[PDB]
Design a protein around this nucleic acid. Structure first.
Length: 49
RNA sequence: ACUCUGGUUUCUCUUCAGAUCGCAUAAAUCUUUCGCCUUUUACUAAAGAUUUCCGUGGAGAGGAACAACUCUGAGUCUUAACCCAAUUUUUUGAGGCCUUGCUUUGGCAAGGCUA
């Protein structure tokens, strides 16, 4: 019963799941160019260790 | 008046949604400006960006019901009584002859002769 209800809730989420998830993927990358990850900013220095 | 064309309704599913998805209209979250400010949870009201929800359209697919009933479109869209021709063709007076030029000859070109 729990699996049935969980699958039902997941199915009700498929209306815009892929659309909003690809928008999120295309939105963090827009933010990532201006604000890179902290570990990335130290990648060249880390390599020299 | 000929022949082929071949639905409508309903229940699901999968996707795409420009368009007033919707001649209607909610909520949440985030970031800014405020309003309350004393801390949550509620909020104040504008802007901006999201998400969810109540619904919607198109197309595709699969079942069911009325599957048997006809459409539309296309195809050549197919018939005789009595009545008719001076602008294009079954009633239309448009005939012939000759000259000279010219063509390897045939013929052609122009003019003349009519009745």
């Amino acid at each position: 019963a729990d699996a049935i209800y969980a699958a039902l809730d997941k199915r009700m989420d498929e209306r815009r799941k892929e659309r909003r998830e690809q928008r999120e993927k295309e939105e963090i990358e827009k933010y990532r160019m201006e604000r890179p990850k902290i570990q990335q900013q130290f990648s060249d220095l880390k390599r020299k260790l």
